Amino acid sequence: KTFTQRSRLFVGNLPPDITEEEMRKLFEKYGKAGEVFIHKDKGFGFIRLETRTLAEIAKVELDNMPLRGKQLRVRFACHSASLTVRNLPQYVSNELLEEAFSVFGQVERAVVIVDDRGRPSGKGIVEFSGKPAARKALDRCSEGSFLLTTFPRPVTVEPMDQLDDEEGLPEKLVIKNQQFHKEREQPPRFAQPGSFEYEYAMRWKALIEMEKQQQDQVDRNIKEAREKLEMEMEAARHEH
Amino acid sequence: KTYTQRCRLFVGNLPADITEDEFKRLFAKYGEPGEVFINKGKGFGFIKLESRALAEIAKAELDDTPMRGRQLRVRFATHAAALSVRNLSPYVSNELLEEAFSQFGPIERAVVIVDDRGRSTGKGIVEFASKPAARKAFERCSEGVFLLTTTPRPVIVEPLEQLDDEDGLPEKLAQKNPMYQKERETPPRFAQHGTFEYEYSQRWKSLDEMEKQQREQVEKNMKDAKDKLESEMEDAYHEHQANLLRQDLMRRQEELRRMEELHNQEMQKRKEMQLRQEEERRRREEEMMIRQREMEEQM
Protein backbone atom coordinates (compact mmCIF):
# COMPACT_ATOMS: atom_id res chain seq x y z
CA LYS A 1 0.00 0.00 0.00
CA THR A 2 1.09 3.67 -0.59
CA PHE A 3 0.24 6.98 1.25
CA THR A 4 -0.50 5.00 4.48
CA GLN A 5 -0.31 6.75 7.92
CA ARG A 6 3.01 4.79 8.30
CA SER A 7 4.60 7.19 5.70
CA ARG A 8 3.10 10.23 7.57
CA LEU A 9 5.67 12.57 9.25
CA PHE A 10 5.10 15.19 12.00
CA VAL A 11 7.44 18.21 11.39
CA GLY A 12 8.15 20.62 14.33
CA ASN A 13 10.20 23.86 14.86
CA LEU A 14 9.12 25.17 11.40
CA PRO A 15 9.50 28.97 10.94
CA PRO A 16 6.31 31.15 11.11
CA ASP A 17 6.68 32.20 7.38
CA ILE A 18 6.31 28.47 6.31
CA THR A 19 4.05 27.88 3.22
CA GLU A 20 2.36 24.62 2.00
CA GLU A 21 4.73 25.10 -1.03
CA GLU A 22 8.09 25.45 0.87
CA MET A 23 7.33 22.30 2.98
CA ARG A 24 6.68 20.56 -0.42
CA LYS A 25 10.08 21.96 -1.67
CA LEU A 26 11.82 20.77 1.58
CA PHE A 27 10.47 17.19 0.85
CA GLU A 28 10.81 17.55 -3.02
CA LYS A 29 13.75 15.03 -2.93
CA TYR A 30 11.39 12.25 -1.59
CA GLY A 31 9.06 12.05 -4.65
CA LYS A 32 5.24 12.52 -4.67
CA ALA A 33 3.78 14.32 -1.57
CA GLY A 34 0.19 13.47 -0.45
CA GLU A 35 -1.76 15.49 2.20
CA VAL A 36 0.08 18.48 3.81
CA PHE A 37 -1.11 20.10 7.09
CA ILE A 38 0.63 23.27 8.47
CA HIS A 39 -0.01 25.60 11.46
CA LYS A 40 2.37 28.57 10.78
CA ASP A 41 1.79 30.28 14.21
CA LYS A 42 2.65 26.99 16.07
CA GLY A 43 5.38 25.87 13.56
CA PHE A 44 4.25 22.18 13.30
CA GLY A 45 2.58 20.12 10.55
CA PHE A 46 2.00 16.72 8.87
CA ILE A 47 3.48 15.57 5.47
CA ARG A 48 2.40 12.17 3.98
CA LEU A 49 5.02 10.58 1.66
CA GLU A 50 4.49 7.82 -1.00
CA THR A 51 6.14 4.88 0.90
CA ARG A 52 7.46 4.09 4.45
CA THR A 53 10.93 3.74 2.77
CA LEU A 54 10.93 7.44 1.65
CA ALA A 55 9.50 8.59 5.08
CA GLU A 56 12.27 6.56 6.92
CA ILE A 57 14.93 8.28 4.69
CA ALA A 58 13.25 11.77 4.81
CA LYS A 59 13.02 11.48 8.66
CA VAL A 60 16.78 10.75 9.07
CA GLU A 61 17.98 13.25 6.37
CA LEU A 62 15.79 16.16 7.72
CA ASP A 63 15.67 15.57 11.56
CA ASN A 64 17.91 18.31 13.18
CA MET A 65 18.34 20.13 9.80
CA PRO A 66 18.73 23.88 10.53
CA LEU A 67 15.98 26.23 9.15
CA ARG A 68 15.66 30.03 9.92
CA GLY A 69 16.80 29.82 13.57
CA LYS A 70 15.60 26.43 14.95
CA GLN A 71 16.57 22.76 14.21
CA LEU A 72 13.62 20.80 12.68
CA ARG A 73 12.00 17.99 14.74
CA VAL A 74 10.88 15.28 12.21
CA ARG A 75 9.09 12.22 13.74
CA PHE A 76 6.78 9.43 12.44
CA ALA A 77 3.18 10.52 13.28
CA CYS A 78 1.36 8.49 16.02
CA HIS A 79 -1.19 6.23 14.23
CA SER A 80 -4.75 7.66 14.72
CA ALA A 81 -6.60 4.36 13.85
CA SER A 82 -4.49 1.53 15.44
CA LEU A 83 -6.04 -1.28 17.59
CA THR A 84 -4.52 -4.00 19.84
CA VAL A 85 -6.28 -7.42 19.41
CA ARG A 86 -6.01 -9.93 22.35
CA ASN A 87 -7.34 -13.52 22.81
CA LEU A 88 -6.12 -14.40 19.27
CA PRO A 89 -6.58 -18.07 18.23
CA GLN A 90 -3.77 -20.70 18.69
CA TYR A 91 -3.36 -20.77 14.84
CA VAL A 92 -3.32 -17.27 13.28
CA SER A 93 -1.48 -15.22 10.57
CA ASN A 94 -0.86 -11.52 9.63
CA GLU A 95 -3.00 -12.29 6.50
CA LEU A 96 -5.96 -13.78 8.51
CA LEU A 97 -6.00 -10.61 10.73
CA GLU A 98 -5.96 -8.24 7.68
CA GLU A 99 -8.78 -10.26 5.96
CA ALA A 100 -10.86 -10.55 9.21
CA PHE A 101 -10.69 -6.77 10.06
CA SER A 102 -11.12 -5.54 6.40
CA VAL A 103 -14.91 -6.06 7.13
CA PHE A 104 -14.91 -2.75 9.15
CA GLY A 105 -13.07 -0.80 6.36
CA GLN A 106 -9.59 -0.34 4.75
CA VAL A 107 -6.86 -2.05 6.88
CA GLU A 108 -3.44 -0.43 6.11
CA ARG A 109 -1.57 -3.24 7.95
CA ALA A 110 -2.11 -6.16 10.41
CA VAL A 111 0.57 -8.04 12.45
CA VAL A 112 0.62 -11.09 14.77
CA ILE A 113 3.30 -10.15 17.40
CA VAL A 114 5.76 -13.11 17.91
CA ASP A 115 8.50 -13.89 20.51
CA ASP A 116 12.15 -14.51 19.36
CA ARG A 117 11.34 -18.31 19.23
CA GLY A 118 8.79 -17.40 16.44
CA ARG A 119 5.64 -18.29 18.53
CA PRO A 120 2.79 -15.70 18.86
CA SER A 121 2.57 -13.63 22.13
CA GLY A 122 -1.29 -13.73 21.91
CA LYS A 123 -1.37 -9.98 20.99
CA GLY A 124 -1.70 -8.53 17.44
CA ILE A 125 -1.85 -5.05 15.78
CA VAL A 126 -4.59 -3.87 13.32
CA GLU A 127 -3.97 -0.44 11.64
CA PHE A 128 -6.87 1.11 9.61
CA SER A 129 -6.43 4.00 7.08
CA GLY A 130 -9.21 5.96 8.92
CA LYS A 131 -10.51 6.51 12.51
CA PRO A 132 -14.20 5.68 11.72
CA ALA A 133 -13.26 2.09 10.58
CA ALA A 134 -11.30 1.60 13.89
CA ARG A 135 -14.38 2.95 15.81
CA LYS A 136 -16.83 0.49 14.10
CA ALA A 137 -14.38 -2.43 14.64
CA LEU A 138 -13.81 -1.50 18.33
CA ASP A 139 -17.60 -0.99 18.99
CA ARG A 140 -18.98 -4.04 17.03
CA CYS A 141 -16.29 -6.41 18.53
CA SER A 142 -17.36 -5.24 22.09
CA GLU A 143 -21.14 -5.95 21.65
CA GLY A 144 -20.72 -8.77 19.05
CA SER A 145 -18.47 -11.89 19.27
CA PHE A 146 -15.91 -11.73 16.39
CA LEU A 147 -14.43 -15.10 15.29
CA LEU A 148 -11.49 -15.38 12.81
CA THR A 149 -11.39 -19.23 12.54
CA THR A 150 -13.68 -22.26 13.32
CA PHE A 151 -12.88 -22.28 17.10
CA PRO A 152 -15.70 -20.18 18.63
CA ARG A 153 -13.74 -18.01 21.16
CA PRO A 154 -13.90 -14.32 20.21
CA VAL A 155 -11.09 -11.75 19.72
CA THR A 156 -10.78 -8.76 22.17
CA VAL A 157 -10.10 -5.38 20.41
CA GLU A 158 -8.62 -2.53 22.57
CA PRO A 159 -7.33 0.94 21.54
CA MET A 160 -3.53 0.82 20.91
CA ASP A 161 -1.51 1.61 24.10
CA GLN A 162 1.03 3.91 22.28
CA LEU A 163 4.35 3.95 24.28
CA ASP A 164 7.73 5.64 23.50
CA ASP A 165 11.08 3.76 24.00
CA GLU A 166 12.92 6.22 21.64
CA GLU A 167 13.04 9.60 23.53
CA GLY A 168 11.78 8.35 26.96
CA LEU A 169 11.74 10.86 29.91
CA PRO A 170 14.68 13.32 29.57
CA GLU A 171 15.83 15.46 32.60
CA LYS A 172 14.65 18.73 30.87
CA LEU A 173 10.97 17.48 30.71
CA VAL A 174 10.94 16.00 34.31
CA ILE A 175 8.87 18.42 36.52
CA LYS A 176 10.97 20.32 39.18
CA ASN A 177 8.57 20.35 42.23
CA GLN A 178 9.23 19.73 46.01
CA GLN A 179 8.78 15.89 45.71
CA PHE A 180 11.34 15.91 42.79
CA HIS A 181 14.11 17.51 44.99
CA LYS A 182 13.25 15.27 48.04
CA GLU A 183 13.40 12.10 45.81
CA ARG A 184 16.61 13.39 44.05
CA GLU A 185 18.77 13.86 47.24
CA GLN A 186 20.08 10.29 47.99
CA PRO A 187 22.12 9.02 44.99
CA PRO A 188 21.84 5.59 43.28
CA ARG A 189 23.46 3.19 45.85
CA PHE A 190 23.38 -0.58 46.61
CA ALA A 191 21.62 -0.63 50.05
CA GLN A 192 24.14 -2.27 52.49
CA PRO A 193 22.87 -5.29 54.54
CA GLY A 194 21.48 -4.40 58.04
CA SER A 195 20.66 -0.68 57.30
CA PHE A 196 17.13 0.90 57.66
CA GLU A 197 16.56 0.85 53.84
CA TYR A 198 17.86 -2.77 53.25
CA GLU A 199 15.19 -4.69 55.31
CA TYR A 200 12.62 -2.07 54.01
CA ALA A 201 13.53 -2.86 50.34
CA MET A 202 13.73 -6.64 51.17
CA ARG A 203 9.88 -6.48 51.71
CA TRP A 204 9.39 -4.92 48.19
CA LYS A 205 11.56 -7.73 46.64
CA ALA A 206 9.08 -10.20 48.31
CA LEU A 207 5.88 -8.15 47.47
CA ILE A 208 6.86 -8.47 43.73
CA GLU A 209 7.71 -12.23 44.09
CA MET A 210 4.23 -12.94 45.65
CA GLU A 211 2.50 -10.56 43.12
CA LYS A 212 4.20 -12.74 40.41
CA GLN A 213 3.17 -16.01 42.24
CA GLN A 214 -0.43 -14.56 42.36
CA GLN A 215 -0.21 -13.64 38.60
CA ASP A 216 0.97 -17.29 38.00
CA GLN A 217 -2.09 -18.66 39.96
CA VAL A 218 -4.49 -16.53 37.80
CA ASP A 219 -2.57 -18.17 34.86
CA ARG A 220 -3.32 -21.70 36.29
CA ASN A 221 -6.91 -20.74 37.37
CA ILE A 222 -7.86 -19.58 33.82
CA LYS A 223 -5.93 -22.44 32.05
CA GLU A 224 -7.95 -25.06 34.04
CA ALA A 225 -11.26 -23.19 33.29
CA ARG A 226 -10.22 -22.95 29.57
CA GLU A 227 -9.48 -26.74 29.47
CA LYS A 228 -12.83 -27.47 31.27
CA LEU A 229 -14.80 -25.19 28.85
CA GLU A 230 -13.20 -26.79 25.70
CA MET A 231 -14.45 -30.26 26.89
CA GLU A 232 -18.08 -29.11 27.71
CA MET A 233 -18.14 -27.57 24.15
CA GLU A 234 -16.67 -30.69 22.39
CA ALA A 235 -19.55 -32.69 23.99
CA ALA A 236 -22.29 -30.04 23.25
CA ARG A 237 -21.31 -30.10 19.49
CA HIS A 238 -22.25 -33.88 19.49
CA GLU A 239 -25.99 -33.04 20.11
CA HIS A 240 -26.41 -32.90 16.23
CA LYS B 1 28.86 6.69 20.50
CA THR B 2 29.87 5.01 17.17
CA TYR B 3 29.49 1.32 16.03
CA THR B 4 27.04 0.20 18.82
CA GLN B 5 24.69 -2.89 18.78
CA ARG B 6 21.95 -0.34 17.71
CA CYS B 7 24.07 0.41 14.53
CA ARG B 8 24.19 -3.39 13.81
CA LEU B 9 22.11 -4.56 10.77
CA PHE B 10 21.05 -8.17 9.99
CA VAL B 11 21.03 -9.14 6.24
CA GLY B 12 19.18 -12.38 5.25
CA ASN B 13 18.64 -14.18 1.88
CA LEU B 14 22.36 -13.64 0.95
CA PRO B 15 23.60 -15.96 -1.86
CA ALA B 16 25.80 -18.88 -0.57
CA ASP B 17 28.17 -17.64 -3.37
CA ILE B 18 29.35 -14.28 -1.78
CA THR B 19 32.69 -12.83 -0.46
CA GLU B 20 33.12 -10.70 2.74
CA ASP B 21 34.14 -7.82 0.34
CA GLU B 22 31.12 -8.38 -2.02
CA PHE B 23 28.95 -7.97 1.16
CA LYS B 24 31.08 -4.88 2.22
CA ARG B 25 30.57 -3.22 -1.26
CA LEU B 26 26.75 -3.43 -0.62
CA PHE B 27 27.24 -0.83 2.24
CA ALA B 28 30.08 1.20 0.57
CA LYS B 29 27.91 4.39 0.28
CA TYR B 30 27.39 4.36 4.13
CA GLY B 31 31.11 4.85 4.97
CA GLU B 32 33.70 2.73 6.88
CA PRO B 33 32.25 -0.72 7.75
CA GLY B 34 32.80 -1.88 11.40
CA GLU B 35 32.27 -5.44 12.82
CA VAL B 36 31.31 -7.84 9.97
CA PHE B 37 30.21 -11.52 10.36
CA ILE B 38 28.92 -13.91 7.60
CA ASN B 39 27.34 -17.43 7.78
CA LYS B 40 27.40 -18.59 4.07
CA GLY B 41 25.53 -21.89 4.82
CA LYS B 42 22.45 -20.07 6.27
CA GLY B 43 22.80 -17.19 3.69
CA PHE B 44 22.77 -14.32 6.28
CA GLY B 45 25.28 -11.81 7.80
CA PHE B 46 25.80 -8.86 10.21
CA ILE B 47 27.38 -5.40 9.60
CA LYS B 48 27.92 -2.45 12.01
CA LEU B 49 27.86 1.17 10.67
CA GLU B 50 29.14 4.35 12.39
CA SER B 51 25.72 5.76 13.56
CA ARG B 52 22.09 4.58 14.17
CA ALA B 53 20.95 6.98 11.33
CA LEU B 54 23.40 5.45 8.73
CA ALA B 55 21.93 2.00 9.67
CA GLU B 56 18.35 3.42 9.33
CA ILE B 57 19.05 4.82 5.77
CA ALA B 58 20.98 1.61 4.83
CA LYS B 59 18.09 -0.66 6.07
CA ALA B 60 15.59 1.62 4.22
CA GLU B 61 17.63 1.76 0.95
CA LEU B 62 18.69 -1.98 0.78
CA ASP B 63 15.64 -3.94 2.18
CA ASP B 64 13.76 -5.84 -0.63
CA THR B 65 16.59 -5.02 -3.15
CA PRO B 66 17.91 -7.85 -5.40
CA MET B 67 21.22 -9.73 -4.67
CA ARG B 68 21.61 -11.91 -7.84
CA GLY B 69 18.21 -13.73 -7.78
CA ARG B 70 17.37 -13.26 -4.04
CA GLN B 71 15.46 -10.27 -2.49
CA LEU B 72 17.56 -9.24 0.61
CA ARG B 73 15.93 -9.08 4.10
CA VAL B 74 17.60 -6.20 6.10
CA ARG B 75 16.42 -5.77 9.77
CA PHE B 76 18.10 -4.40 12.96
CA ALA B 77 19.87 -7.31 14.78
CA THR B 78 18.29 -8.12 18.21
CA HIS B 79 20.49 -6.50 20.94
CA ALA B 80 22.07 -9.59 22.69
CA ALA B 81 23.13 -7.52 25.80
CA ALA B 82 19.82 -5.69 26.63
CA LEU B 83 17.93 -5.63 30.00
CA SER B 84 14.39 -4.83 31.25
CA VAL B 85 14.24 -2.67 34.46
CA ARG B 86 10.88 -2.07 36.28
CA ASN B 87 9.75 -0.58 39.67
CA LEU B 88 11.15 2.94 38.91
CA SER B 89 9.94 6.26 40.46
CA PRO B 90 8.18 8.62 37.96
CA TYR B 91 11.23 10.98 38.53
CA VAL B 92 13.97 8.40 37.56
CA SER B 93 15.02 10.05 34.21
CA ASN B 94 16.78 8.39 31.19
CA GLU B 95 19.96 10.32 32.23
CA LEU B 96 19.70 9.12 35.90
CA LEU B 97 18.85 5.48 34.92
CA GLU B 98 22.03 5.67 32.70
CA GLU B 99 24.24 7.27 35.47
CA ALA B 100 22.96 4.57 37.92
CA PHE B 101 23.62 1.62 35.52
CA SER B 102 27.03 3.13 34.41
CA GLN B 103 28.39 1.53 37.67
CA PHE B 104 28.12 -1.99 36.02
CA GLY B 105 29.92 -1.20 32.71
CA PRO B 106 29.67 0.80 29.43
CA ILE B 107 26.03 1.97 28.76
CA GLU B 108 25.16 1.85 24.99
CA ARG B 109 21.64 3.22 25.82
CA ALA B 110 19.21 3.70 28.79
CA VAL B 111 15.56 4.87 28.30
CA VAL B 112 12.60 4.98 30.71
CA ILE B 113 9.49 4.01 28.64
CA VAL B 114 6.83 6.84 28.71
CA ASP B 115 3.05 6.70 27.88
CA ASP B 116 1.13 8.88 25.32
CA ARG B 117 1.26 11.95 27.71
CA GLY B 118 5.04 11.59 28.43
CA ARG B 119 4.51 10.30 32.05
CA SER B 120 6.90 7.49 33.19
CA THR B 121 5.53 3.87 33.23
CA GLY B 122 8.15 2.66 35.82
CA LYS B 123 9.56 0.31 33.10
CA GLY B 124 12.74 1.12 31.09
CA ILE B 125 15.42 -0.51 28.84
CA VAL B 126 19.20 -0.69 29.60
CA GLU B 127 21.55 -1.71 26.71
CA PHE B 128 25.19 -2.59 27.70
CA ALA B 129 28.23 -2.59 25.31
CA SER B 130 29.15 -6.20 26.38
CA LYS B 131 27.10 -9.27 27.52
CA PRO B 132 29.30 -9.38 30.70
CA ALA B 133 28.26 -5.78 31.67
CA ALA B 134 24.56 -6.92 31.58
CA ARG B 135 25.19 -10.31 33.38
CA LYS B 136 27.08 -8.30 36.09
CA ALA B 137 24.16 -5.77 36.39
CA PHE B 138 21.61 -8.70 36.47
CA GLU B 139 23.35 -11.02 39.05
CA ARG B 140 24.18 -7.99 41.32
CA CYS B 141 20.66 -6.35 41.36
CA SER B 142 18.89 -9.81 41.61
CA GLU B 143 20.90 -10.59 44.84
CA GLY B 144 21.65 -7.02 46.15
CA VAL B 145 19.04 -4.20 46.61
CA PHE B 146 19.95 -1.36 44.15
CA LEU B 147 17.98 1.87 44.90
CA LEU B 148 17.83 4.99 42.60
CA THR B 149 16.10 7.60 44.88
CA THR B 150 15.49 8.89 48.46
CA THR B 151 12.47 6.47 48.65
CA PRO B 152 13.88 2.91 49.05
CA ARG B 153 12.10 1.36 45.97
CA PRO B 154 14.45 -1.40 44.67
CA VAL B 155 14.86 -1.85 40.85
CA ILE B 156 13.80 -5.22 39.26
CA VAL B 157 16.41 -6.27 36.63
CA GLU B 158 15.23 -9.06 34.25
CA PRO B 159 16.50 -9.99 30.75
CA LEU B 160 14.63 -8.11 27.93
CA GLU B 161 11.77 -10.02 26.16
CA GLN B 162 12.32 -9.03 22.46
CA LEU B 163 8.97 -9.26 20.54
CA ASP B 164 8.79 -8.91 16.69
CA ASP B 165 5.91 -6.53 15.68
CA GLU B 166 7.31 -5.89 12.11
CA ASP B 167 7.48 -9.28 10.26
CA GLY B 168 5.14 -10.92 12.83
CA LEU B 169 3.76 -14.36 11.72
CA PRO B 170 3.20 -14.52 7.93
CA GLU B 171 0.72 -17.05 6.39
CA LYS B 172 3.50 -19.06 4.60
CA LEU B 173 5.02 -19.78 8.09
CA ALA B 174 1.57 -20.44 9.73
CA GLN B 175 0.69 -23.03 6.97
CA LYS B 176 3.64 -25.24 8.22
CA ASN B 177 1.21 -26.47 10.99
CA PRO B 178 -1.67 -28.47 9.39
CA MET B 179 -4.00 -27.16 12.20
CA TYR B 180 -3.93 -23.68 10.45
CA GLN B 181 -5.72 -24.63 7.14
CA LYS B 182 -8.19 -26.83 9.17
CA GLU B 183 -9.17 -23.88 11.48
CA ARG B 184 -9.44 -21.52 8.41
CA GLU B 185 -12.22 -23.74 6.87
CA THR B 186 -14.77 -21.41 8.61
CA PRO B 187 -14.24 -17.75 7.49
CA PRO B 188 -14.10 -14.73 9.87
CA ARG B 189 -17.69 -13.85 10.98
CA PHE B 190 -19.85 -12.54 13.88
CA ALA B 191 -21.48 -15.41 15.86
CA GLN B 192 -25.20 -15.12 14.81
CA HIS B 193 -27.77 -15.89 17.61
CA GLY B 194 -29.41 -19.38 17.45
CA THR B 195 -26.09 -21.08 16.45
CA PHE B 196 -24.41 -23.40 19.04
CA GLU B 197 -21.09 -21.43 18.63
CA TYR B 198 -22.88 -18.15 19.70
CA GLU B 199 -23.57 -19.70 23.15
CA TYR B 200 -19.86 -20.67 23.60
CA SER B 201 -18.64 -17.28 22.19
CA GLN B 202 -20.45 -15.64 25.20
CA ARG B 203 -19.00 -18.30 27.61
CA TRP B 204 -15.48 -17.34 26.33
CA LYS B 205 -16.34 -13.61 26.85
CA SER B 206 -17.31 -14.70 30.44
CA LEU B 207 -13.84 -16.33 30.96
CA ASP B 208 -11.93 -13.35 29.39
CA GLU B 209 -13.87 -11.00 31.80
CA MET B 210 -13.11 -13.36 34.78
CA GLU B 211 -9.37 -13.17 33.80
CA LYS B 212 -9.45 -9.31 33.63
CA GLN B 213 -11.48 -9.24 36.93
CA GLN B 214 -8.97 -11.58 38.76
CA ARG B 215 -5.88 -9.69 37.35
CA GLU B 216 -7.23 -6.27 38.56
CA GLN B 217 -7.78 -8.18 41.90
CA VAL B 218 -3.92 -8.73 41.96
CA GLU B 219 -3.32 -4.97 41.20
CA LYS B 220 -5.53 -4.14 44.29
CA ASN B 221 -3.61 -6.79 46.37
CA MET B 222 -0.26 -5.06 45.50
CA LYS B 223 -1.62 -1.46 45.99
CA ASP B 224 -3.16 -2.21 49.46
CA ALA B 225 -0.10 -4.32 50.60
CA LYS B 226 2.41 -1.48 49.74
CA ASP B 227 0.18 1.11 51.58
CA LYS B 228 0.46 -1.36 54.56
CA LEU B 229 4.32 -1.31 54.07
CA GLU B 230 4.34 2.56 53.80
CA SER B 231 2.82 2.89 57.36
CA GLU B 232 4.69 -0.21 58.79
CA MET B 233 8.21 1.12 57.82
CA GLU B 234 7.38 4.85 58.50
CA ASP B 235 6.42 3.88 62.14
CA ALA B 236 9.72 1.86 62.52
CA TYR B 237 11.29 5.24 61.41
CA HIS B 238 9.60 7.43 64.14
CA GLU B 239 10.71 4.65 66.62
CA HIS B 240 14.31 5.10 65.23
CA GLN B 241 13.95 8.97 65.33
CA ALA B 242 12.79 8.60 69.01
CA ASN B 243 15.69 6.16 69.86
CA LEU B 244 17.94 8.93 68.33
CA LEU B 245 16.37 11.70 70.55
CA ARG B 246 16.46 9.25 73.56
CA GLN B 247 20.26 8.50 73.27
CA ASP B 248 21.24 12.10 72.23
CA LEU B 249 19.36 13.60 75.26
CA MET B 250 20.90 11.04 77.74
CA ARG B 251 24.42 12.09 76.48
CA ARG B 252 23.60 15.85 76.99
CA GLN B 253 22.35 14.96 80.55
CA GLU B 254 25.48 12.83 81.40
CA GLU B 255 27.87 15.63 80.17
CA LEU B 256 25.74 18.28 82.04
CA ARG B 257 26.07 16.24 85.32
CA ARG B 258 29.88 16.10 84.64
CA MET B 259 30.33 19.91 84.08
CA GLU B 260 27.93 20.63 87.04
CA GLU B 261 30.19 18.39 89.25
CA LEU B 262 33.24 20.38 87.90
CA HIS B 263 31.42 23.66 88.83
CA ASN B 264 31.00 22.00 92.31
CA GLN B 265 34.71 20.92 92.57
CA GLU B 266 35.66 24.60 91.76
CA MET B 267 33.18 25.99 94.41
CA GLN B 268 34.69 23.67 97.11
CA LYS B 269 38.28 24.91 96.29
CA ARG B 270 37.05 28.58 96.61
CA LYS B 271 35.24 27.68 99.92
CA GLU B 272 38.37 25.65 100.94
CA MET B 273 40.93 28.54 100.65
CA GLN B 274 38.46 31.22 102.01
CA LEU B 275 38.10 28.95 105.13
CA ARG B 276 41.95 28.62 105.46
CA GLN B 277 42.32 32.47 105.23
CA GLU B 278 39.73 32.90 108.08
CA GLU B 279 41.50 29.99 109.96
CA GLU B 280 44.84 31.99 109.97
CA ARG B 281 43.11 35.39 110.62
CA ARG B 282 41.69 33.86 113.89
CA ARG B 283 44.94 31.81 114.52
CA ARG B 284 47.11 35.03 114.46
CA GLU B 285 44.52 36.87 116.69
CA GLU B 286 44.83 34.09 119.41
CA GLU B 287 48.71 34.06 119.25
CA MET B 288 48.93 37.92 119.51
CA MET B 289 46.12 38.10 122.19
CA ILE B 290 47.89 35.37 124.31
CA ARG B 291 51.46 36.69 123.55
CA GLN B 292 50.19 40.05 125.03
CA ARG B 293 49.06 38.17 128.23
CA GLU B 294 52.62 36.62 128.37
CA MET B 295 54.41 40.08 128.29
CA GLU B 296 52.06 41.61 130.97
CA GLU B 297 52.60 38.76 133.55
CA GLN B 298 56.41 39.15 132.82
CA MET B 299 56.47 42.64 134.53
Swiss-Prot record, chain A:
UniProt crosslink position (Glycyl lysine isopeptide (Lys-Gly) (interchain with G-Cter in SUMO2)): 29, 32, 59, 123, 131, 176, 182
A Gene Ontology BP annotation from the UniProt entry: negative regulation of oxidative stress-induced neuron intrinsic apoptotic signaling pathway
Post-translational changes noted in the entry: The N-terminus is blocked.
Modified residues (N6-acetyllysine): 131, 228
Entry keyword set: Acetylation, Activator, Biological rhythms, Chromosomal rearrangement, Chromosome, Coiled coil, DNA damage, DNA recombination, DNA repair, DNA-binding, Immunity, Innate immunity, Intellectual disability, Isopeptide bond, Methylation, mRNA processing, mRNA splicing, Nucleus, Phosphoprotein, Repeat, Repressor, RNA-binding, Transcription, Transcription regulation, Ubl conjugation
Assigned GO CC terms: chromosome; fibrillar center; membrane; nuclear matrix; nuclear speck; nucleoplasm; nucleus; paraspeckles
The keyword DNA repair appears for this protein: yes
Region listing for DBHS, in residue ranges: 1-240
Compartments in which it is found: Nucleus; Nucleus, Nucleolus; Nucleus speckle; Chromosome
Tissues in which the UniProt entry reports expression: Heart, brain, placenta, lung, liver, skeletal muscle, kidney and pancreas. Also found in a number of breast tumor cell lines.
Location of the RRM domain: 7-74, 81-162
List of residues that carry Phosphoserine: 80, 195
UniProt-recorded Gene Ontology molecular function terms: chromatin binding; DNA binding; identical protein binding; lncRNA binding; RNA binding
Quaternary structure and interacting proteins, as annotated: Monomer and component of the SFPQ-NONO complex, which is probably a heterotetramer of two 52 kDa (NONO) and two 100 kDa (SFPQ) subunits. NONO is a component of spliceosome and U5.4/6 snRNP complexes. Interacts with CPNE4 (via VWFA domain). Forms heterodimers with PSPC1; this involves formation of a coiled coil domain by helices from both proteins. Part of complex consisting of SFPQ, NONO and MATR3. Part of a complex consisting of SFPQ, NONO and NR5A1. Part of a complex consisting of SFPQ, NONO and TOP1. Interacts with SPI1 and SPIB. Interacts with RNF43. Interacts with PER1 and PER2. (Microbial infection) Interacts with HIV-2 Capsid protein p24; interacts with high affinity. Interacts with HIV-1 Capsid protein p24; interacts with low affinity.
Function: DNA- and RNA binding protein, involved in several nuclear processes. Binds the conventional octamer sequence in double-stranded DNA. Also binds single-stranded DNA and RNA at a site independent of the duplex site. Involved in pre-mRNA splicing, probably as a heterodimer with SFPQ. Interacts with U5 snRNA, probably by binding to a purine-rich sequence located on the 3' side of U5 snRNA stem 1b. Together with PSPC1, required for the formation of nuclear paraspeckles. The SFPQ-NONO heteromer associated with MATR3 may play a role in nuclear retention of defective RNAs.
Protein name: Non-POU domain-containing octamer-binding protein
UniProtKB/Swiss-Prot annotation, chain B:
Modifications after synthesis and translation: The N-terminus is blocked.
Modification type Phosphotyrosine: residues: 3
Coiled coil ranges: 207-299
Cross-link (Glycyl lysine isopeptide (Lys-Gly) (interchain with G-Cter in SUMO2)): 48
Subcellular location: Nucleus speckle; Nucleus matrix; Cytoplasm
Location of N6,N6-dimethyllysine modifications: 24
Modified residues (Dimethylated arginine): 281
Record domain RRM: where: 7-79, 81-162
Source domain of life: Eukaryota
Effect after changing residue 245 to A: Impairs DNA binding and ability to mediate transcriptional activation
Residues that bear Phosphothreonine: 78
Disorder association: A chromosomal aberration involving SFPQ may be a cause of papillary renal cell carcinoma (PRCC). Translocation t(X;1)(p11.2;p34) with TFE3.
Quaternary state and interactors: Heterodimer with NONO. Monomer and component of the SFPQ-NONO complex, which is probably a heterotetramer of two 52 kDa (NONO) and two 100 kDa (SFPQ) subunits. The coiled coil domain mediates interaction with NONO, and can also mediate formation of long, linear homooligomers (in vitro). SFPQ is a component of spliceosome and U5.4/6 snRNP complexes. Interacts with SNRPA/U1A. Component of a snRNP-free complex with SNRPA/U1A. Part of complex consisting of SFPQ, NONO and MATR3. Interacts with polypyrimidine tract-binding protein 1/PTB. Part of a complex consisting of SFPQ, NONO and NR5A1. (Microbial infection) Interacts with M.tuberculosis protein Rv3654c, which probably leads to the cleavage of PSF, diminishes the level of caspase-8 in macrophages and suppresses macrophage apoptosis by blocking the extrinsic pathway. Part of the HDP-RNP complex composed of at least HEXIM1, PRKDC, XRCC5, XRCC6, paraspeckle proteins (SFPQ, NONO, PSPC1, RBM14, and MATR3) and NEAT1 RNA.
Stated role: DNA- and RNA binding protein, involved in several nuclear processes. Essential pre-mRNA splicing factor required early in spliceosome formation and for splicing catalytic step II, probably as a heteromer with NONO. Binds to pre-mRNA in spliceosome C complex, and specifically binds to intronic polypyrimidine tracts. Involved in regulation of signal-induced alternative splicing.
Entry domain remark: The coiled coil domain mediates interaction with NONO, and can also mediate formation of long, linear homooligomers (in vitro). The coiled coil domain is required for optimal DNA binding, and optimal transcription activation.
This protein's name: Splicing factor, proline- and glutamine-rich
Organism per entry: Homo sapiens (Human)
